Amino acid sequence: LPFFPPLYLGGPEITTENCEREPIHIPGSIQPHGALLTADGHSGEVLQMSLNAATFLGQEPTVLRGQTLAALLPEQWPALQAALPPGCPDALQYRATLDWPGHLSLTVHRVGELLILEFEPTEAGPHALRNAMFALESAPNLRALAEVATQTVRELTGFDRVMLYKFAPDATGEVIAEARREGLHAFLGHRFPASDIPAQARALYTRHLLRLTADTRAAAVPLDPVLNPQTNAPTPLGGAVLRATSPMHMQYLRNMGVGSSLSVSVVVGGQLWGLIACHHQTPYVLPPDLRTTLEYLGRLLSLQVQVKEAADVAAFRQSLREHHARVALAAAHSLSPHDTLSDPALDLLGLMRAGGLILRFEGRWQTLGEVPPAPAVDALLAWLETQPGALVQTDALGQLWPAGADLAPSAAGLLAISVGWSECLVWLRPELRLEVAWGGATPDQAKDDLGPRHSFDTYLEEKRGYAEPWHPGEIEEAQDLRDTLTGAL
Amino acid sequence: LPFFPPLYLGGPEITTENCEREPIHIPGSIQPHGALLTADGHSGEVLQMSLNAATFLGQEPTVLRGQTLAALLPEQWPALQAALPPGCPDALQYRATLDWPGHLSLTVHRVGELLILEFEPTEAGPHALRNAMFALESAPNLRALAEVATQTVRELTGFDRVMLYKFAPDATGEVIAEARREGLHAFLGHRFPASDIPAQARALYTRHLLRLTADTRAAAVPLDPVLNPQTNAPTPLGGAVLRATSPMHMQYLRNMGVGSSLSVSVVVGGQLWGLIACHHQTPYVLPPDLRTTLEYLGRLLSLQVQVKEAADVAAFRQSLREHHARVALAAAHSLSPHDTLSDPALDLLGLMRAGGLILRFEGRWQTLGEVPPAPAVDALLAWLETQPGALVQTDALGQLWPAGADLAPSAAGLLAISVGWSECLVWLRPELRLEVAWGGATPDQAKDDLGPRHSFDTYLEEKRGYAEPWHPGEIEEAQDLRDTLTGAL
Numbered sequence: 001l002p003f004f005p006p007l008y009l010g011g012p013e014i015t016t017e018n019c020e021r022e023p024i025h026i027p028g029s030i031q032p033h034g035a036l037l038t039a040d041g042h043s044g045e046v047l048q049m050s051l052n053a054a055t056f057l058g059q060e061p062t063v064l065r066g067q068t069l070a071a072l073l074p075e076q077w078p079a080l081q082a083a084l085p086p087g088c089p090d091a092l093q094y095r096a097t098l099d100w101p102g103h104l105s106l107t108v109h110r111v112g113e114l115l116i117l118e119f120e121p122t123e124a125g126p127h128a129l130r131n132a133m134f135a136l137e138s139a140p141n142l143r144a145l146a147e148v149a150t151q152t153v154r155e156l157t158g159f160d161r162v163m164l165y166k167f168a169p170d171a172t173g174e175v176i177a178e179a180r181r182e183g184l185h186a187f188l189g190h191r192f193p194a195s196d197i198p199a200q201a202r203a204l205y206t207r208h209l210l211r212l213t214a215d216t217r218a219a220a221v222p223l224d225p226v227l228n229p230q231t232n233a234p235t236p237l238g239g240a241v242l243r244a245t246s247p248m249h250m251q252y253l254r255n256m257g258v259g260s261s262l263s264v265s266v267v268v269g270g271q272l273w274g275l276i277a278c279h280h281q282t283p284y285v286l287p288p289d290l291r292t293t294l295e296y297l298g299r300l301l302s303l304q305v306q307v308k309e310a311a312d313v314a315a316f317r318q319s320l321r322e323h324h325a326r327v328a329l330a331a332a333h334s335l336s337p338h339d340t341l342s343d344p345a346l347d348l349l350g351l352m353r354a355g356g357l358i359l360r361f362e363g364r365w366q367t368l369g370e371v372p373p374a375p376a377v378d379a380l381l382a383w384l385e386t387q388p389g390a391l392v393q394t395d396a397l398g399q400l401w402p403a404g405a406d407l408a409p410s411a412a413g414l415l416a417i418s419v420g421w422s423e424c425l426v427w428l429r430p431e432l433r434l435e436v437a438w439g440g441a442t443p444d445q446a447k448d449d450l451g452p453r454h455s456f457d458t459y460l461e462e463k464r465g466y467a468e469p470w471h472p473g474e475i476e477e478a479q480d481l482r483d484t485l486t487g488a489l
Numbered sequence: 490l491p492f493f494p495p496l497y498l499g500g501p502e503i504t505t506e507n508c509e510r511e512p513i514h515i516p517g518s519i520q521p522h523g524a525l526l527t528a529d530g531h532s533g534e535v536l537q538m539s540l541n542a543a544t545f546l547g548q549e550p551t552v553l554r555g556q557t558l559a560a561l562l563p564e565q566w567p568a569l570q571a572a573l574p575p576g577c578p579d580a581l582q583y584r585a586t587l588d589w590p591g592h593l594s595l596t597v598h599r600v601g602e603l604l605i606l607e608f609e610p611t612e613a614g615p616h617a618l619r620n621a622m623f624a625l626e627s628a629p630n631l632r633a634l635a636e637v638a639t640q641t642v643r644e645l646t647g648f649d650r651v652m653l654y655k656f657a658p659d660a661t662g663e664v665i666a667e668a669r670r671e672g673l674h675a676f677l678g679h680r681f682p683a684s685d686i687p688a689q690a691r692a693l694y695t696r697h698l699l700r701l702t703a704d705t706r707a708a709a710v711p712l713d714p715v716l717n718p719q720t721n722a723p724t725p726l727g728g729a730v731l732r733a734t735s736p737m738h739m740q741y742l743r744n745m746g747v748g749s750s751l752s753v754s755v756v757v758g759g760q761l762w763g764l765i766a767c768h769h770q771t772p773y774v775l776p777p778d779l780r781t782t783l784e785y786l787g788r789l790l791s792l793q794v795q796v797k798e799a800a801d802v803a804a805f806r807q808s809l810r811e812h813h814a815r816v817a818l819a820a821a822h823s824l825s826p827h828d829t830l831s832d833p834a835l836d837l838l839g840l841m842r843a844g845g846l847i848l849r850f851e852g853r854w855q856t857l858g859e860v861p862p863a864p865a866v867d868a869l870l871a872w873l874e875t876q877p878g879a880l881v882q883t884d885a886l887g888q889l890w891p892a893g894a895d896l897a898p899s900a901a902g903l904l905a906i907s908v909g910w911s912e913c914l915v916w917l918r919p920e921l922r923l924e925v926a927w928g929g930a931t932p933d934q935a936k937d938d939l940g941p942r943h944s945f946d947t948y949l950e951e952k953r954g955y956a957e958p959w960h961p962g963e964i965e966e967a968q969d970l971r972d973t974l975t976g977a978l
């Protein structure tokens with residue numbers, strides 16, 4: 001993923017035209033509620049410092065500049081050496097607490113030949129986390145898991161709003177569960193455009209799992225100097241939780257009325273599955289010991305989301321097992337595929353919950369249920385021959401095939417399967433007039449203004465030419481039956 | 490899985506003949522370092538109690554018997570009602586701490602219409618767990634992950650021995666990492682028979698993830714009464730950590746010299762992947778707040794084991810990618826499969842690290858490398874025709890095919906692939922004389938004595954007629970190439 005140079009290196013202004021390429025990993029600034037130091041990995045000499053480090057460490061910038069970490073932190077320097085060896089990934093963190101003439105929290109991570117240290121004040125429900133773990137593990141489905149997760153984070157952090165945001169293959173997520181204070185606007189059930197979380201944002205969020213913005217009305221504190229003296233290059237602050245949030249997302253949060261934000265990634269199989277989005281109407285800083293709990297819950301959700309999704313599919317397959325057996329049995333002892341598969345006792349329509357069925361064998365076809373007219377069927381099979389693969393799935397045929405949207409009332413959803421495409425089975429679902437609740441704007445209205453939008457209320461998009469999407473278990477069952485009948489002939 | 494009736498219901502004596510069917514889930518007794526109460530799920534009336542509950546609660550058994558949990562625990566009863574609704578799984582636990590005229594730890598779980606409560610004393614490294622999490626996540630391979638896990642548990646619990654025990658498809662596990670005190674016997678690298686952890690033991694360990702034996706020289710405390718008054722049946726103590734360990738495993742631990750034991754399951758995909766086995770030479774009771782850390786580490790290992798295994802396979806596939814490309818390219822433009830695939834430029838031997846290659850096409854075969862004689866090849870293909878499937882894998886051909894062990898020196902490992910078996914490719918690996926370090930006895934010597942064995946030192950079994958096992962990536966690559974060449978013809 002490409003990136004523009006930062007603003008302090010002659011970088012262009014970030015607009016909705018090019019926000020996809022903003023270098024958020026190197027803002028050259030941090031958030032003011034904490035101090036940041038940058039030291040050498042081998043010698044320990046301090047190289048960079050935020051302009052407010054003097055207020056956090058009680059010493060002048062010219063005093064700390066050039067001081068070795070051995071003299072500044074004699075009790076912690078060898079632990080830093082042993083904990084972060086050279087060549088370790090930048091996601092490895094080491095945290096401790098220090099006594100300063102209050103108590104500070106120091107989190108160090110290594111980015112190449114550079115040691116990054118974060119200082120933020122910390123203070124010194126023990127079983128709510130364990131009970132939360134056992135509650136998440138015993139949740140019956142993904143919806144209940146999401147409700148227990150949101151309610152748990154809500155009861156643990158005191159945030160005004162806590163929600164679980166689930167991404168889609170087109171990067172447009174949806175609030176699947178919400179735990180909010182009374183009187184707040186409900187974002188539950190709303191879908192949001194992919195523009196709100198750009199590509200490099202999700203990419204960064206797949207590696208560094210937690211980030212926050214403690215005060216959306218707080219100016220960032222720069223570093224001195226902004227360029228790393230080792231390489232005369234920007235300092236990678238991707239792993240720093242104190243990293244200055246991009247001004248785009250801060251203007252976005254202020255337009256939403258959010259005073260403080262935070263999110264923890266839910267990564268599954270190396271892909272960003274979702275986020276635990278947190279909102280507070282007023283500025284708020286969570287103690288680090290409390291954030292660690294949210295990180296544990298992030299790992300737990302990463303595991304349980306996988307488990308619960310797998311189980312939710314396996315239950316549907318269990319629901320279709322016996323029917324699969326009957327169809328396979330009848331198919332094995334078949335002398336005419338048309339007469340055998342079109343038998344109502346097999347009920348190939350109810351298997352996939354389809355309103356139309358097209359069976360192509362021996363150079364001819366037969367229908368079953370509400371189907372398009374005959375020349376439309378000829379055009380649909382002649383269209384299917386052009387597509388490669390053994391399976392075709394779509395909940396809106398008009399998107400994959402123009403001039404086929406005329407067939408939307410009878411055949412809007414298509415699930416076809418081949419045995420080349422000379423002998424195939426086509427499942428058709430009729431059109432279902434849908435209303436999608438968007439959170440302010442559809443993806444079409446995301447690039448109309450050069451700044452982040454101000455409207456976030458419910459926007460009901462009337463989607464037409466669509467059918468009910470195919471459940472994942474219907475597709476798994478589909479290809480299983482595809483290998484079955486392909487083996488039978 | 491069947492079970493004998495317990496000893497208190499006319500059950501037979503447990504020997505090595507029938508230890509596979511011991512009802513460990515209902516010992517009718519608990520470990521003496523804690524108290525256990527059994528109450529009704531609807532009314533809260535206490536129904537059962539351990540014979541030492543008076544020493545833990547300061548009240549006579551006749552006093553507590555029949556008392557409602559509302560009167561006994563007024564501060565906790567509604568929390569128990571709301572936390573454990575009827576119909577919830579027995580793995581759901583709710584833990585709190587109480588002040589008793591010291592401080593106790595109460596863990597409650599629901600088994601049907603029965604509430605089970607556990608009382609054990611608790612006392613009131615904050616960042617070692619977070620640093621442990623980041624260290625486990627940044628481990629490069631599974632071996633390093635196991636070393637960091639064992640070292641972490643060792644430094645957190647103070648156990649004399651901590652090890653990671655990885656199961657095999659035949660339920661015979663191996664100590665893949667070990668963190669032990671100086672001078673102790675090393676179980677690292679030793680394989681152990683499946684008899685040590687029976688079937689119902691692993692089955693129970695897949696659902697309830699932690700169990701322990703705080704003192705192997707401590708007699709169990711029974712319940713009063715032993716039968717549940719609701720059903721006149723034994724009380725299921727499978728979820729109770731205070732459950733009396735089976736006497737078989739306690740005699741086993743004493744024969745090993747272990748004073749205190751504990752293990753946390755590492756479940757992956759619903760299957761028991763491994764265990765975090767812990768040993769202490771003297772009796773030891775871990776505080777519950779400390780065990781919760783080990784449970785968190787159990788979830789973390791359940792996630793990271795999956796990640797690291799997937800990555801370790803993906804690295805091998807990456808190592809074979811280019812070679813796969815070359816073989817596919819040459820195979821597409823083929824006019825003679827024998828001449829094309831036997832070309833040394835393709836190097837089909839080095840792809841799978843095999844010493845012999847048999848190519849069967851167009852009704853004839855050709856060899857490549859060290860292979861059995863011609864009639865042995867005819868018998869090997871005529872044998873392959875009888876086996877169904879597209880792939881055959883074995884690291885010891887003599888096991889799958891007697892009279893074929895005569896071909897062990899040239900062909901001990903076999904990896905065959907079909908395109909029926911009329912046209913196939915066979916990879917052969919020569920015999921490798923192996924020495925397997927067993928921990929006391931091989932599976933053959935596990936049923937010679939009616940009690941658990943006393944010998945646990947290294948027993949080097951000289952395994953002959955075996956080859957180097959096929960790496961999982963070699964098999965994935967094998968079937969990928971199988972669909973490739975099958976599609977090419």
Ligand SMILES: *C/C=C1/C(=C/c2[nH]c(/C=C3[NH+]=C(/C=C4\NC(=O)C(C=C)=C4C)C(C)=C\3CCC(=O)O)c(CCC(=O)O)c2C)NC(=O)[C@H]1C
Binds near residue numbers: 249278
């Ligand atoms: C043209 C660029 C745009 C843009 C940039 C942008 N956005 C982020 C980070 C986030 N955006 C989020 C979106 C949401 N927050 C919500 O509460 C909801 C719905 C209730 C949505 C859809 C989120 C969650 C983040 C992560 C940060 C956080 O949790 O607060 C960044 C990167 C910021 C950073 O962390 O460094 C950037 C550059 N956002 C847009 O809307 C367009 C205009």
Ligand SMILES: *C/C=C1/C(=C/c2[nH]c(/C=C3[NH+]=C(/C=C4\NC(=O)C(C=C)=C4C)C(C)=C\3CCC(=O)O)c(CCC(=O)O)c2C)NC(=O)[C@H]1C
Binds near residue numbers: 508686690702737928
């Ligand atoms: C014929 C029955 C036998 C038998 C029964 C048995 N075993 C268990 C439980 C365990 N056995 C374990 C085995 C090992 N512990 C080790 O340290 C090593 C190698 C260093 C091995 C192979 C383990 C770990 C357990 C789990 C309990 C624990 O962690 O201490 C049970 C069930 C006990 C319970 O928890 O209720 C039973 C009935 N063991 C045999 O060896 C044969 C004779």
